Each structure stands twice: as structure tokens, then as C-alpha cells.
Amino acid sequence: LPPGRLATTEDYFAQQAKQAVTPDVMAQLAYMNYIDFISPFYSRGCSFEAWELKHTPQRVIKYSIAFYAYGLASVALIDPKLRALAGHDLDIAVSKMKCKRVWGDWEEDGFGTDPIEKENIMYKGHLNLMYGLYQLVTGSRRYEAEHAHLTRIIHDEIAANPFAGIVCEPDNYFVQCNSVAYLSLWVYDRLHGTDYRAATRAWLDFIQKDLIDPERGAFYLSYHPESGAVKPWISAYTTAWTLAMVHGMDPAFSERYYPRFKQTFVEVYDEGRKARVRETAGTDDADGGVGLASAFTLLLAREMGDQQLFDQLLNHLEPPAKPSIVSASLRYEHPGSLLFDELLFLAKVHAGFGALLRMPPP
Amino acid sequence: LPPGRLATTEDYFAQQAKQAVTPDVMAQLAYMNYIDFISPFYSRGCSFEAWELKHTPQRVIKYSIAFYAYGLASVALIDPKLRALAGHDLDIAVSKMKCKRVWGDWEEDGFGTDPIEKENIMYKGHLNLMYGLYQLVTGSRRYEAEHAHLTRIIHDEIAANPFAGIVCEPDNYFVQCNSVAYLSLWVYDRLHGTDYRAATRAWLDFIQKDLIDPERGAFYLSYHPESGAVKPWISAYTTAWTLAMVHGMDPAFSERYYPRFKQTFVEVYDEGRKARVRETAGTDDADGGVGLASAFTLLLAREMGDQQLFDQLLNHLEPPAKPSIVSASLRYEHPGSLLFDELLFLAKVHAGFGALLRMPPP
Amino acid sequence: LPPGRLATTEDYFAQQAKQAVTPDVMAQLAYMNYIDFISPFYSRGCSFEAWELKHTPQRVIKYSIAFYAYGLASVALIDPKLRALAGHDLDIAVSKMKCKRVWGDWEEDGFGTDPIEKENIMYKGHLNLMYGLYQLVTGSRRYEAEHAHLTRIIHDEIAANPFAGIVCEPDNYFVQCNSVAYLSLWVYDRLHGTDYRAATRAWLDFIQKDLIDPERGAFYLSYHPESGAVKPWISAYTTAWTLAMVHGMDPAFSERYYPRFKQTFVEVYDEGRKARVRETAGTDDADGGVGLASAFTLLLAREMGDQQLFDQLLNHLEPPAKPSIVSASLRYEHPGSLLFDELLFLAKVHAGFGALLRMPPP
Amino acid sequence: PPGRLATTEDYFAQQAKQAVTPDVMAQLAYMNYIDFISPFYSRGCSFEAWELKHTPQRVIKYSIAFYAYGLASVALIDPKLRALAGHDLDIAVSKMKCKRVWGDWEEDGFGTDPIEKENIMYKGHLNLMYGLYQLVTGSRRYEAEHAHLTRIIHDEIAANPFAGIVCEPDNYFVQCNSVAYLSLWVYDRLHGTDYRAATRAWLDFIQKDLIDPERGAFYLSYHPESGAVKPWISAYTTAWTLAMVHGMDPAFSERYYPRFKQTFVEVYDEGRKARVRETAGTDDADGGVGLASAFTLLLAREMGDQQLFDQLLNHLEPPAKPSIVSASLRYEHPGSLLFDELLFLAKVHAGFGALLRMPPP
Amino acid sequence: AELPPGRLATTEDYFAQQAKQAVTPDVMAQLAYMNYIDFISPFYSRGCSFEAWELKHTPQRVIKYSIAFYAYGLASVALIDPKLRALAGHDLDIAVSKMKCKRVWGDWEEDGFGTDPIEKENIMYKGHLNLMYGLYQLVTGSRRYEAEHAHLTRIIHDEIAANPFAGIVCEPDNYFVQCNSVAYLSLWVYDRLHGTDYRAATRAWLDFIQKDLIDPERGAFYLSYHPESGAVKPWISAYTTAWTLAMVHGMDPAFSERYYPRFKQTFVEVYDEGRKARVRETAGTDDADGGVGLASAFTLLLAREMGDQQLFDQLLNHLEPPAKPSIVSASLRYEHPGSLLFDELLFLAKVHAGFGALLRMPPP
């Protein structure tokens, strides 16, 4: 057990075989569920006290809820005795995700009154994937009508666009936001026997043209269809997130680029015991930009089964954040980034996006 | 009298036989009633200055008023010369309980504009019990119409549900919130000769299935009917509160579990002179979560007639809170939790929920 | 003479015979009248800058204006050359008293949109007495219509109630608030030759039943007609205020209780040179509760002609408040209570409520 | 002297030299130079300059008026600055009409129209400013408004049993009336009318219960409903009133000026400095509103008393720590409200009589 | 040659960017500040979000100038590096969208001047908007804003034709030469795109501003003109002059060439043995960068426009080092920006190709 760590990499990777979460993951689920009013998964209502207490910026709440939801789906697969709890939490995740506090930036920015009708794939990609994971975990048809409606909007918008995929803000295309939307089509197809996922091949061909640097195994920050502009910086957090989700749909795609991604961005230090991730090229600084390169690489390492890099990144991320378990509930005194407990939770439990797609019924 | 204690456990337990409150309980009633504008029981108006001055969070004000009300009902039973004052204070408790500042979280959370119509048993359970205790103490029919209306809503909601009882927020079931609602039906029946309390047996059978760990004498945190999920943590404050109220309706039920509850949660320390209560299993930490395990166990100890545990808990709770009596009014310099003066007041005077049910008329 | 005092007790009691206020009272009138915009008696407008600068709580502004008004009425009787100024200041006192900033707490508490129509005798008792004193001082009929309307409301409400008098907040009866309303009926009768004051005898009989402890010469805090409750604490500030005003209507009543009041509450200390007043029984602490026991006893001492107690209380109250006269205007650096300059001003000039009733015309 | 920017001789010579002192030019730079935040940047209802100096809302109307009276003297001092002074007066009038400036009248509950009746504090200044604008520029931009407000003031004087007009209802101030009467003299100069004929009855009225003739000092205020005169004399009230009256009846101010100085003015530091007591029965300087010394500085200028001017400016300016940065004047520690406004005005003031006789452009 | 201390690149490097068809690494790091981080970078989205400006504490009234100066810099980036032209175009698209948000123009309404910021006057706002419409279309060839561009160009032309003085006021009765210079340049850009002759109005404007608005001996414009009163504020302004001469150089090079040497004599202080320069804002002071505090920053732009490498080097040696630039994760930040519009004006001066060269920008 390296210093400041709560459990071994071996323990996190063995959770599924043992059909039990580690005590520190159970303590994270207690933070998420235990205390009246202030725990994030206390109620379906439009209360965001848990996010106010952690100082989550408004624009990031949608990602907070989504990453918690993706983690809860893996908890359901790990421990059958926690599947009902995971289902309950996903029900709350979907309700909170639909509150105006979460999507309202779309209206305040002047882009429209309806966050699903067009564009805004950042928000509605996550919502659509969450509808699907909720139904895979619980077998409940509570959101089926909404799920079918949003899936058809995403399919129709892909069919209408001359580029493969959907924009976020108008004229802003991000590969990582698209990767969530495409994965949501795979989940819908698993539930209903449809073929919405057939659009995936053209998308994977499109993002391998001007959106990737194939030598570095790295995606450019964004694409802008009106001007044809690709922003000339590569992004580690963008790439780590995209390759993790793509691995669930086309494993060979992520396997091809993963080693080049690591060469481009990953700095091993402290005699092989630790790693930290550079956000872009032409710098020695770790975790610049949004500051999430290391945390998303931790998720990618888990998705790809790379125990060594997982261990190195968690040795960098967790100890300085000063975890403590008080009354069987996990707190970090010094979270090192946005989405800190969310992304460490997700990476600790993640079963692979492929395994979530094949989740047995309840 | 140990240092920082204001009176002996023997003195608190003798109050009913002597037909007099201890001087420190009288000084608590002075805090509650004495100073113009800022005392909590100054006026019927929707002024919450007393709660603003002690920094009571909005969501907790409803519990503050309720616990004061339950204490005042016991004062009425202890000293006939204080019964009119207790009645006046209960009148104010009911008026304040109906102010939007108290119930308004129900609307802000997006659950509805009417706090009584459906669900919300946390709020309307306390309100219904308060209507009843007011009428037991005073004989006044001021709230009788409202009391009948809310009692019929609670009866109809119980009859309609496939599980025994009523949810708080939608799909959130709490045993402690239900225990208040069921006790309110016993009080209505005492006033009117009805049999709304007949629903209690099915409820006591239901909460002894998946909602209790019978070996540990401990209720799980909550139940979620849509998913069938029971949150997998046991809760001391939940159990202490529920067993205290159930003792008034089915004494044998609470007698069965009380010894197991104490084994599971109660830590005796300082050579038997003190006790503190763990909030959940798998921790040594006292008073985690909402931080009320010890304070609600103090009430349960009083309800069960356990003088030794009462003395031990009050020796833990009161001295560090630094009580002082200035101008015959009680203040705590360092309240150790939410609802601190409310729950110590209640535990000091509590005559048993059974004895409140049999309160002689005015 | 004594250290930190501005003038001798002999000087304050001689003001009427010399037909001149002391220099320190003139300096108080300068604080009240001198500086543009920020002096309290600058204009009729709904500007409360003077009260914002002293941090007067909203609920206390009505008492601030009233006590200033009662002092100004005595200034009119002391110095005929200041009677026109006193009249001008009383005109402003009445205008400001009618501003929503002053009465608005009645609406915000949820008791109604009209502060005069019913109850609220705290506010409308003072207003009615102020209408009367304004007309006694000036001979002006400016407010005569309003005065007749409010006097008739007070008379009708007394006639309708089964207890003698009127409540403040609904179901809250205070003897001190009633004493102001009854005195306002004596002033109306002195202006118009009516007999509204005939209701006084039944009131004086009523407050000598459960509302007084006749052995201790002390009124209980309050009465609550719905429940029949009398709060079981005696109050010095309540008693001092009530006996001062009653002395103007039934001198024998206040003469009977005054010596017992002093025995119950007044602590003489520092070898007979100083006095301070306990607010309630069963304490050694001075000036608890609202903190006005000593200041209202100073007024009562003046009303009863007790120079020794006046001198003792002013030796306690004034020196620690650190009076300073700058540019012929009085300021206190450390006022010891609410209504500090108001009540010291009033006690220094007070000619007796009886003498204000027989105030000869201009 | 140390902390002074220029000699008393220099300020009093400005008109003869047809040039403002460099420090007065630096004050005009503070007033005019920086985009958005200078007080005379635009006609708009922007009050950034006043927010930055923490001017209380109720004082902004006096700030604008005193700047305007100074700008009228700048126009008389330097013909090359007359167009600038005219532009600044145009802005002064526009800003004076913004609700931020007059709005206290409505918020206090006295009415929605600040001109219709009473409120002579506000509308006296506005009327004098309309007149000075037209004397400086020859522009008829505000002529209609000027005629309307002049007729309101004349009609209200004619209707009142006391000589003049109240501020807040039942509050009569001699200093506020003195501005209104002077505005009638300016209207008469522009149009050949005789609105100023009302002045004699006013000067007779204020010499009854409103003045202590032995001390040369006005009482604080008069209250017609009650007949009350507040029993304190006021230096700032007297200094302001005598300065403005000197422009209409020089003999009146000449009669009282020496008694005023005996009553209120303390010479100290071996004759080099002076400070002014606000009322009688105190040794404290600059109590009450804290403007006794600043208004006495203006009165000293109006009466041609160079010695007292020098003494007061030696008291007022050095502790305020003037600095000129990039040819613009700032005070680090202004000692009162209206500080840069009243020092500006006193430094340039040509006399209210000379403003009345301003030659056309 | 040598890199002076605290500077990021040599004057020679900035002036060679066009010939090398590449921006310096520090200009690329400025474009990364402008474009890189989600939500908080100024050119993240078309939306009415101003987080980037809230984080730098930009006063509301200055946001319109911030966007405009970024836009003028981006136009030169498009001319420097063809591989960045599409990015420059995308950023200009966002600049135009943000420029139309009420947060940017709203001061016009709050000041009480009207509910429509374009209909009349307000030439400081609508001059920049009109020039930005034109630069967007020169860079991208996109007709997205063409209708709006034609509408605003005709408003500006009609208002010039209607006024007895040459040009348009900002606030009513406030005339500024620098604000007019932007509007006139916007007519030259429209003419380049459409073959029209709206720019013919320029000659009468250049004749007008050489009467009472300039001190021809000192090569310096007066602060402002006020048509109602005929008043010219009697102070000369360096930032006013530097800005006006830079833009006029694109329309009448001989005009700016005539006054530039006199401007430098009047305002520019060379110090530290010829290595540094700082600019006095007005006459009759030794203090540098008084008033709005932008004399030196606008003189840096003018030096670039006039091809004066020596003065450019001296001013940048004064401005940049004390601001403490650092490049973190390939993005430029200043720890102590010395003025308003600091990163905007240094960015612009570093890339500026000349307003004449932007007018002749080849198509994509």
C-alpha cells in the first residue's frame, strides 16, 4: 500500500471478481447517499446543496452528475447487492440532470429555451447515455418515452449534418462530447434491437481525418464547421476521454492510439512510482488548461486494463488530496481539480464501457 | 452535580412526581418566552429572528419547532400551573409551522405549491402531531378543521400505498418520519374516538422486514419503493428517534430492539461516567452524519426509563456546550450540534409518548 | 459633580422653576435638530438616516420616536421660548411615526396591511398619545381628524374585549402598551371635554388581578387571552414603564407599589452612590432581557420625585456611556442599551405625565 | 507656505492677467479630462465621478451647482476658456435634471415633480444655473425652461405670507432663498424684467427673527407652521447667505461681515491660519455639516478680504494633501463634503455682482 | 540581435512574422490564452458569456474596445500565417457575435441615450462593429453578416451626410477624432469588398480635423470637440493622437507621416540610455501614461503602423517586463498588467501588419 493511498490497484481491479466494492468505494457511496439534504443523491428535487458545498461551477454540474452516473452503472455490475441502490441513484441522477440549474447555461448564453431540440450535444449526449444506463441497471421504463425522443433527435441531427456528429454551442464541434452521444446510441440499440449505432463507422472515419494527429495519437481541441477551422493545439483530457468511450464501441481504434497518446502526454516520475499528464504539446507543465488530463487518463488506464499507469496516476492524484474516512464516509481535504471525487470514484469502479453495454438484466 | 451539569438525572426523572420543572428547565422556558421580538415563542407571526440568531438552516426549522412542541406537551403534564403557558407556546408553534419560511423548501425543490396535498410526511407528520398535542393541552378547537383534513389526507395516502406508510420527497421513505405520522393518528383517535391508529399494526409488520437489521436492533437509512432499494447503512439517530416514538404505540416493539441498539451504537467511556453514540456500523467515530445520534439516544434513554444511559449521554453532551444562566434564562455558548437546546430541553422533560396520549383533559 | 456626569440631579429637577433646560439637555436638542439631513428631527419626510447611523433595529424605531416626543412635551412645559421648537419637532415626530419604515413590521409579520384597524396597540397607542401631545403643545388642529378616528378605534376595541384593554400581536397582551393607550384617552378628553378616560377604572382593576404580584409590586411579562396564560416571570422594565404612566392617571396606584418595586428589583451599590435594576426575580444580574430596566426606572424615579434613586441610576448609566459635547451637540461614545439617548433625554426633562395633561395653552 | 499650490496674490490677480493659475487649470483637468469618470464627461445620467468620491446622494445637487458657479467665473477670467466653461455649464444643467440628483424629493414622499412647489434648495440652484449658462454662452437652449421656473419662483414668493419659499415643507432656510433671489437678478439681466423687485421685502424679512444683528449671524432655520426659529446661529449658513446677498445688496453684507468674523472666526498659528466655529457656545471648529471654514473662504473672496482668504486656505488645503499628477489636481485627504468644489469656487470667484454684469460673448 | 531582460521575443522577430509566414511562440501562446480553456477563454463561444472579461476585471464600458482590438489583431494573424487564417476567421465570427450582446453595448441604454445602439450617434460602438463586420468578411469570404454590414455602413454614411461638422458624435454633443477614425476606416473596408465609393467622405473629414481639432506644430489632437457649443477641450492627448494617426495611416499615409515626428517630440520620453521609452498623455507634465493610462500602449501600435522598430523596441521594453509575462502550458499570462486593454494592445502591436495591408488582404 503506497503512502496516502486507501487501497491497492490490485484491490480495485479485483472488485468485479470478488463481487464487492473496496471499503473506500463504499465510503464514497456513503458520501453520495448518507447525510439528509446535503448528500448529492439525497432526492430527485432541484436542490444542488452538495454542489454549492464543493463550489462546483454551474457549467460543470452536468459533468459531475454524468460521471457519478457512469460510476454507479459499474457499481451495479460489481455487486448485485448494490444494484438496487445504483438504480435508485441513477433515477436521481436523471431527475437532477433535467433541472434548469444544470442545463440553464444554454438559455443564459442566448442559444435557446429548449436544451435538447438542436445542438448542445455536451448536455443531451450525457442525458441520453444516462437514460440508457438507468434502464440497463433497473429494467424500469420510467424514462423510455423521453429516451426514444432524444435518441431520434440525435439520429436525425447526425443524418442532417455534412460532418459526422453534432455541435455543442453553435459552430463548436468536440470529439469527446460526440463520443458520449454515439455510445448512447449503442445503449439504446442494446435495449431495443435497433441499429442507430450504424452511424458510428462514418464518425470514427471522420475524426481520424483533420481532428487527430495520428503520429501523436492525440485529438485537436475542437473543430468549427462554418470556418473549417481545427484549433491547432492537441489536448490530453480530450483524447483520454474520447479513447476511453470509443474503446467500448471500437476497441481496435483505442488500442491503435493508446501507446502514442502515452508517449505524447504521460510523464512517469519518482523512479516509476508516479505519473502526471501534460494537457498539450510544447510544454513540460502537467494538468494545464481545464486541469483534468491526469484524472481522465486514470479513467482511460482503467478502460484499457493498464494497472501500472493506473497505480502511477493514483499515486500522483490521491495522496496530496488528503483523503479521510470519518463515520464510514470519504472526504478529500484538498481536491486537486474540478470533478475530483467524481473522476476518482469512476476510475476506481469502472468495468469498461463494453461491459456496461453487455450488462445482464436484473 | 458533575462540573458543567445543571441538575442531577434523579432531579429530571422526579419532575413529574414533584409537579415542578427543575430551575434549568424553567430557564430554558425563559429563553423560549422572555425577550421581546427575538424569543422563539414571542408571537404567532411569520418572524424567525430567534432561528436567524442561532443560524438554524432553513430545512431544520420545521424540526426545531416540532421538538420544542413535543417538550412543551410534557411541561403541560409535569406542572399544571405551566399548562396554560405550554398551551400558548403550542398555539405559536402551530402558527409558525404553517409559515412559508418553514415549509417553502417543498416548493423551491420543485415538488409542489401545497405542502400537505401529497407526500412530504416529514413536514405534515409533525404538523399533524402538533395540531393534536395543542388540542390535548388546551381543549381549544382552533385548528380542529385543519387537523381533521390533514388526518384524512394521511389515512387516504396510507390506504392507497402498496408499502405501509407515506414518502417524504417522492420515492424517499423514512421510518422516523412515518413514526411521527402514525403517532399523530393515535392522538387524533384519543381526541375524537376514531380508529385511524388501526393502520399501525401493518406498519410495524412492514418496518420489521427489509427496513430493520433485527440482530443489531437498527433501521436502515431509508427505503425507495420505485427501485425496491434499501440504503445499505444502519443509522443510530434514525433508530433512536423511531424506537422512542414507537414505544408510545407498541412498547414491546421498542423493548425487543433497545438492548441490541445499545450494543450496536453506544460507546460507554471515562470509567462508566459518559457515553457517546456512533451514527453507523464500521466506524469508531461518534455522532457522524447529521450529528444527532447522541442527542436522539438521550431522548430514547428517557422514553425507555434508562437513567444510567441518560446520565452518561448528558455528561458527554452538556458540559462542552458551556451552559450559563444569566437573568434566569438558559444559553449554551458552544452548542455541539443542530437542534441542540431543542433536543436537550425535550429529553430533560419528556414524560413518554404514551403518557402524552393519556394526558388528562383541561 | 459626581465623576462623568454632565449636571447635578438638583439642576435637572430645578429646570422647570428656572424656566431653562440645562446646557446638556440643550446639547441633546442640538443633536436632535442641528445637522442637515442626518439629525432625527430634520424633516417630515420618510428618511431614517439618524436611526441608520445609531443602528436602531427597525422594530424599536416606533419607541425611539415616541420617547423623543414625550421628552419634547416636557421641554415645551420647561421653557416657553423652546415651546415653538418642541411643537415643530412633535409635528415631525407624528409624520415620521406614520411612515411604513416605522409600522411596516405589522405587515411583514403577516398581521395586516393597516397598522391602526385592529390590535397593534404598541404602535397605535404611541401614535394616539403623540397626536394629543402635539395638539396640547401647539394648539394646531392639523391631526385632529386622524386623532378622533384613532381614539374612536381604541375606545371601540376596549368596549368589544372581555378583558380590559387591547392586544399587540394577536393574543399578546402587555400592560405597558395598554398604559400608553389609556393615557392617550386622558389627553383626548383634556382637548375635547369627552369621557373616553372612564374606561380606565375597569383597566386598573383588571391589571391588579393575575397580571400583578402585589407583594413584590411587579407586573408579569404578558397575558394571553386565548389560553388564559400569564407568563410566570415578573419584569422590572414592564413595571417601571407601567407605574410611570399610571402615576399620571391614578397617582395612588403607583404610590402603593413603588416602594415594593424598589425592594424587588433595585440594587444600591458603591456605598449608596449608584443603583442598577434587575430585570426579573431569581437572578443577581442587572439589566437582562431587553436591557432597559435601569433606564425605565430612571424615568419612574423622575415621575415619582425620587431624587436619590434618580441620582444613583444616572451615576450607573451615564459615565460608562462617555458623554461628549462637541460643537454644542451631545454624543455618547458607548450607549449601554437600545433607546439610550432617548430615555436619558426623557428622564432629564420629564415634568410628570399629570403635568403634561394639564399643560396650559400657548 | 508649505502644502499651498499658489499665493493668495496669484488667485486675486487671475482676472487682471486673463489667465487661471496652473492649479485651477489642473482642477479643470480633473473635471474634464478622463473618459467616463470625469464629472463633466457627458450630458448623460452617469454619476461615476460622484460614486468615486463617495458624495452622498443628497449633496450631488450642491456639488454640481458649486462647480457651475466656479465655471461662470472661469468664463469671466479667461476668454479662451469661455467656450469650455459654457460646455461644462451645459453638462451641469443636464446632470442637475437627472432623477439621481433630485430623486430624494420623491423618495422622502414630498411629490413626483421636483419644481412644481417648495424644494427651493434644488430649483433655486437649477434656476441660477439656467441663467449663468445663458450669460456665458448666449445659447437659448434652456430659455423656455428658465422662463417657466422663474415664473414658478416669482408666483410662489407672491403667494407666501413670509418672504421666500420653503425647502422640505415647513422648512425655511435663508441660504437656499439667497440662491433663488440671485436667480431672479440673473433672469432680469438677460430679459429686462423686474422679478428682482421682490428682493427688498426678503432682505427686510431675514433681518427680523432670522438674524442676530449684534453677532452678524443667521439662525439655522425658520418653520412657518409653528413660527419656530431654531435657537442656534450657524456660520456656514451666514457665510453662504452674506456671499450671495453681497451680489444683490452689497451694503447688507458689509454691515454684518465684521460682526460675523468676531462671532465665528478663530485666527491661530500667530496670524498665519484661521478656522471657523459653526455655532456659539463652543471652541470647536467646523462642527455640524463641517463647511463653516470652506463657505467663509468663499465669503472672504466675495468681500475682497485677502488676509482671511490666505489664513483659511492655509488651514484647509495643506492637510488635504493636494498633488498634481499628469497636470490634473487630486486631494488625498479632503477635509469635508464638497471639498474640491468649494476650494475651486473660492479660488476663481469673481463676485456674484461681476457674474451679473458678465459681458456678452 | 540580443533579447532584452523580461522580453519574450526580439523586435526583429515580431517585424519578420509576415515574411516567415509564422507567428512568434509568444503570439501563439496569446492565441492559446484566447482560445484554449473551455468556458473561460474569451473566444470559446458565440454566446453572451463574458467570464474571460469578469476574470480580468474589465470594466463594462471597456469590453467593446477589448473585443475590437482582439479582432484587429486576429485580422493581421490571418495575413501572417495562412494555416491560422481559418482560426482567425472563427475568432472574428465570435468577436462579432459577442460585440452584439447587450452586456457590451448596454451602457448606451443605462446612460439614457436610447434602446438601439446603432440607429444614431454612438460611433465608438458602431464604428468598431462596422470595421469588425468588414474584417470578418475580408478574412473568411463569408456573407453571414453582409446584410447587417450594408445596413450599418449606410447608417454611418447617411449620418455623415446629415451633419454640418465632418463625422458622427459618441454620446450626444461629444465628438472624438479617434472614434471617427474607426468609422471612416470601416467605409474603406466596405468599398474594398463591394467596389463602392463610401470612402469619398474621408477627404472632408481629414480637412475638418486639421482645423481646430489639431495643434499642427505639436502634431497632437485636442481631447474632444462639442458641436452644440463649438468648444474644443484645451488639452492635447497622446493616446487620442496615437490611435487616430495609426488608423489614418491606412487611409492617408501622408497625413500621419506629416505629424508623426512632431507627435514623438511632444509626448515621447526616451530614457535608460536609449533602451526604453514612455509616453506623456498631455502637455505641461513630466508624468507618463496619465488619464486613461494608454498613451504608451497606443504609441506601441502607432510605432508598428509607421515601421519605427526603434520606438517599438523602447516602448515594449518599458511595457512588458514589469507586467511579468509567463508561459504556462503553452498559454501566455501577465501577472501585473500595467493598464486596461493590456494583453489586447500588446497582442495587436506584436502582429499588426498595417491598416493599409489589411485593406489589400488577398482572398482565401
Ligand SMILES: C=CC(=C)CCCC(C)C
Ligand atoms: C434644505 C437645504 C439646506 C439646508 C441647504 C444646505 C445644505 C448643505 C450645504 C449641506
